[PDB]
């Protein structure tokens, strides 16, 4: 022999090599690949289309008896790079695929001198999962990635793990944070899927668990909803017989009705109807509608509509009571007949103004009482919302 | 002979193999492929472009007399993996294609020892279908997938099924739910398409039938439309001679006119005009316009416009009737001439106020009667809408 | 000889075959391809980018003297499938390309025993054309598809038709309807393009003619524009001295000014300015502005602004005329000096109210006359619009 | 010899041909390619991303001494088609690339009998350029396309032109018009780029110059801005003591403030701040704000706020002047004490009404004068805008 | 020997060359590649997805002992072009990849006569980085590009620099400006990443540092926020007892509440909550709400609500003080009983008007004082904003 270089090893073990055969001596022995996965980024979550988009780093090794050499008589070389398109590579795919993500190809693999061939590749994957939007900003999502051979059965290709599942689960080394989703764990699980008798497939199932960071939807949702309550609370201080109080309240209701629709496009809702945020917005609207209807009732109650006297059943029910329940406090005959008519024409205007003053007195007491009831209702709703947030926030 | 391995089988039957020929001994015998399909996901439905996007799992087998071996004298091997790019593969396409979906390639096939070669592959397909939007949230869609050989005729390539059509039709095993579309059935149908005499093609036609889940468009459509009726019903309680009732009603009409346009972009409408939802919105607007015109009529009827007396033809037509149809109830001479002028200057103001009070009395009776008629009309429309929904919802 | 199979024919005529040469015996004879096209779908029309996107079915045949065999002594085979990547294929492209559409490849062709090789393929094409938007919902579009060889000249590759042009023009067999565009005809035309002397190219030019279905833009354009006229016609019935009539009219003008802008994004306009729909909207706004200015004029005319008496030049011009043109109908001396001052303080208030009543009488007659003129103008515009639509609709 | 066909020429000169070598006999002689370009379409201009997208037609030829034959003894053939993937092709790229546009490949080239090999190909290119938006609808853009070899130096590959630069510059034969951009010229320029000593590269630089057609942004910008001035000019005719004049002006300011924001998204602005159109809109808003502030000043000046008498310093400054500057014009004693009190209670109401009438008289003269000043200011702005447009429009 | 050409060199050193082996004589010696990078364009920055998109120019060289020749006896050739797909190329990738950018391939490399093979290629790269939006328009971003071999270890492939790091850092020669991001420096850094013992990888880490040009978000943010303060300052000059002052203020608050939401979509916010711009907008709203509440307080204070006399505790607290703190200043008996009643009916109306005048006098002094306080608060906020901008702007 001689020494051209140590490309004569690669000449030795790729001369008569057939990349089509499953590389075993005895065909009864399965090829056992050993995989694991580290998660790199969560690229997209489509809650409408039920489609997850991540990016992982992937590696695998297997053993073949056709890529073996003694490490002596080749100047002590124990591993080398072989191009990927010249050896047998197993078809390990994902069941949950809905599309093909673009990922760089890696043109080389390692091969040790026992036949342990190692493959390293990054791969973008676009999978489909069931996403629960029962509670939109505070939600964990449990997505599956099932690695399986698409053709070969479990007596043909078998799948194990590279390393221990306790350290696959607790691995957050290169995950890109600051990206709306916190990784929690990547839990592997082995299952043998049998489609029927005598055809069973090896599957390795990774459960990724991600939690949404709720800080995004606390300035885009909680701020204008809490904000348009203080405009109501200021707008109750308008006197009801002005006329612009109704125009105030309907303008503010218009301003919030625009807000609900301009929010409801950027917040998805799938297979349930609405989350609890939709219930809290309906309660926020039910407060504002009765805030409007109270002003409509007082403006109806306080007007000049040639109306009758206030009822003494409901005068001492309301003025003497509500200051102690809550609040507190021959020609001379002709001239006589001419003057009596002028006195009568003035006293009826005087009486019709005193009736209006009594109804205006009833209306302000009611507008104070209903304002107290509304203020305590808004306060009791706000403390319920805070004490429901603090149960989540603590631990 | 000897024993290198059992790659010598693959050396035996791929040495002089030609992947260009249609692999039969007698050229008069057609190659019969046997296909079936399980549906995985409905990715998109473009009602505007009439384009469906699904993702299926696909499999097929056929027989070739060039891939046969005796299972003895090869150490009892009965099947093996052969790369896909080294054997003849039929060109089974879809007639309804409009684009190419990205799908992973599967580089291996099984080959049994009789020549039964099996191919498993997933494939994303983007097809075109006719979509009826006659009833937008409650609609089934009947889409076709016609598998056919694009070149070969029925004496050259023939298409059958893998398994029975009764179990292709009732197969929902891996379909991704929670995704706006329920699968109902995938019904296969064989047809021999003859383009003319002496050129006929085999076609296998799958009819997928999907039904939209109507829960999405019942919180984005039914909630604000039913919601802006209660603002009208509250807004009738304003007294009409205030002036802000008209400003209330036109603001609410503005608020719903924004709503119709901001909805009509996210709801498609194709080849029919509108669905029935568009008719129900036009009726919802026809109620609101007459709600506006009633207030315009009462505000015209109740004003101070130096107007004449109320007509006694229509005074006892309206006050004595509508409380029983529906509702219920030398210097002394100079001073005399000076005082009579002051009495005359006051009595005309008194008369012009009593005329205005009589017209204000007519206006409130009309505003009560028209409010009752409007409330019963809205109630009779709502119960018709409920009893049309309950026919769909039951069974 | 013997009988392996009839793959020995494909061994016979693809052994020493060179797929690079233009396959003729005499190099002076041109290769004549024969093409035709059936239209399948109109996928997109971008009026802004001037880009058409269709999907066609395409087929072609040509003759080569290197793929010939006698049908005897091969067990009577007269045609067979040959892979596409092993024979010469002409480069027939489109001049109007701006991009590459994704289309499935067809890996096989037929070859008859005279050398007639037939190719069938579907192809998505994205071309560029000039689109006229002079009349937006009622428009035909005349788009060209010029098939030509990109390199070879007319003494090298020549292009004819498969079948007669009278039956290419009248072919609507597989076109997908219900898709905003009706196909009308696909008219072929042969032209020899000479770029200069001694370099001429064969071109086959298909003119596709498509017509838009105008039903889409008759519920999204004609309905709110005709709708916001009846709100004006109702809003004239408000009495002008109320104060909320101006607030009515400016709110309705705001509501239509939002409508024009929220429509003008989804309706394109290219190289002309606007279509006639833009002129009809400007006339619709010119009616609404004079509807506003009439109310401004009457509200200016009817007010209490310490104004003078109505002019008798224009009192009998307007009250006696317009009911026949159109409408119809020592201490006693001290007390005397005290009372005369009170009479004088009342008679000036009486006079200042009678002046206001006379101006209020003029204002209502003008508000009736201008309402009649506006109603007849709107009616004369609507019948002109109907009689312009009916010329299009008939035949 | 014999005559199979004239594929024996292609057998002769592609038998031992190496497509990897730069095809020259003497390695010191550079390969001179000769290129030119005709512009077909301007597909997109992203002013935000500074990215141009065009579509050109491209051609080039070069000479190689390995593709030569005598035209005799091959039956007088002087040119033939050779596939592109079998000869040496230079790497001519563009420096300004930011992406890869999709373009059809052309699989054949011509080769003459001297070695002149001609290549024709269309190519979509996506380049980056500096875009000036100093004047948005009236702007020319000067974009560069630098053709260069990406690897080879000027003693290895050299670049010249096909034809004369005077006829490359004036070539508008197949450009697609009606597409928002007029082509003006495509000016070529040769530069030898030397990165350092002893490494210089040949570059051929095409300057495309395109001009925007300003007709698009004259109906979407100039029409509502000129339109909302006439609503102001009509709205000055409201009498200021009505109360709805302020509600008119703020509603119109709201309507234009919506307009500015809903325009400012579809008009880009990059590296300068704003164009001059942004300055003209700020002046359009500065007119409308002082139109609002004038009404606020008159409404403050005309009210009933228990105010004092008009100042005689500013009464003859304003009523006697502005009609010549611009505009034009024992018991009897008890009854006496009772009546004197009634006279005193009426004369103070009379005085407080005459004071209000004098302030109302001052307010109308000011509302006429400021309306004249505002009308002349709007007219002087409009004629300045017209005489700045007409300088551009003429020649 | 003879002279065909100098393609016999390429015949000499690519005849028995194996492109799969790592090209060294002694396998213990690592292949040292030498890279550097010049930055060309910043294509996109997604602050939501944390994804950077740039375009660089890249070059590298390495040494191989299999591509060596003596420059004599080949007619003095010292370098030549070899196709890329025929030699060994190292796999230098980026750790921060999330996708594959489209970049043109370069089909040739240089090879010198010592084996120094040089590779030039442009490459679009889409990477992921952490982006801080703590201060949105004034922010630098520190993004990493880690070049590493994806498979080979540091005894197999090693990475150095082409040129000195001081001139890689200060290199801005071909960067495309005018594009929202200024390049500052590209700083290289070498690190040996050891994943565990006996497996270490060579990494070359480039830190690109880019700064946003803040001029874009100073006309789209600072202009309407500073603009809607002057509308408030004008709107305080309305007299509070008019009624349209409240309708002014709530319309302006509506107009700014639309503005905040229509801005907040085009300005991202990630992992922090909000930048300081969000705090400045909340302060801008806190000024406008107290501007509204002041008008509500004065309108409540100034009305006719059958109210009592102004308190003398707070009359000399406010009228005598605030003009020195800030601002400045038998039948005759029957007729007697008839007249005394008329005097009494007038004097109570007189008293109820004088009470309203005293409250109107208090309200205007308060409306002046609060206007001065609000104007000084807005001025003190504006100068704080200017003196915080000028610290950034200086040097
Ligand atoms: C579509 O446009 C083409 C324009 O090229 C029309 O062109 C003419 O077609 C006739 C035959 O139909 C030729 O004889 C003329 O020479 C063509 N004229 C030109 C200027 O090219 C074609 O008729 C149009 N089709 C329709 C339906 O309008
Ligand atoms: C064709 N041209 C030739 C020289 C000018 C630009 C192009 C591209 C190419 N240049 C370059 O590739 C290039 N130049 N410099 C200074 C660099 C620094 C770091 C990385 C690459 C480069 C070769
Ligand atoms: C080489 C060979 O023939 N092996 C076995 C044979 O011993 C038995 C038979 C029964 O199935 O199966 C096979």
Author numbering:
A (entry chain C), B (entry chain B), C (entry chain A), D (entry chain E), E (entry chain D): 7 to 335, 397 to 462
The paper states:
5-HT3Rs are expressed either as a homopentamer consisting of subunit A or as heteropentamers of subunit A in combination with other subunits (B, C, D, or E). 5-HT3Rs are widely expressed in both the central and peripheral nervous system, and form a part of the brain–gut circuitry that directly control peristalsis, emetic reflex, and visceral pain perception. The 5-HT3R antagonists, referred to as “setrons,” are the standard first line of therapy for the prevention of chemotherapy-induced emesis. Granisetron is a competitive antagonist that inhibits serotonin-activated currents at nanomolar concentrations.
In the present study, we have solved the structure of the full-length 5-HT3AR bound to granisetron at 2.92 Å resolution. According to this 5-HT3AR-granisetron structure, residues from loops A, B, and C on the principal (+) subunit and loops D, E, and F from the complementary (−) subunit form an enclosure around granisetron. The cationic center of granisetron is a tertiary ammonium in the bicyclic ring (pKa 9.6) and is positioned at the deep end of the pocket nestled by Trp156 (loop B), Tyr207 (loop C), Trp63 (loop D), and Tyr126 (loop E). However, in comparison to serotonin, granisetron is larger in size and extends further outward into the subunit interface such that the aromatic indazole ring is oriented parallel to the membrane and makes a cation–pi interaction with the positively charged nitrogen in the guanidinium group of Arg65. Granisetron’s position also requires Arg65 (loop D) and Trp168 (loop F) side chains to reorient. Instead, an alignment of 5-HT3AR-granisetron with the 5-HT3AR-apo structure shows a counter-clockwise twist of β- strands in the ECD, leading to a small inward movement of loop C closing in on granisetron. The loop C conformation in 5-HT3AR-granisetron, although open, is distinct from other antagonist loop C conformations because it lies between the open position of loop C in the 5-HT3AR-apo structure and the closed position in the 5-HT3AR-serotonin structure. The TMD of 5-HT3AR-granisetron is rotated clockwise compared to 5-HT3AR-apo, once again in a position between the apo and serotonin-bound structures. Although granisetron induces a rotational movement in the TMD, the pore radius is comparable to 5-HT3AR-apo and the permeation pathway presents barriers in all the three domains. Thus, the 5-HT3AR-granisetron structure represents a non-conducting conformation.
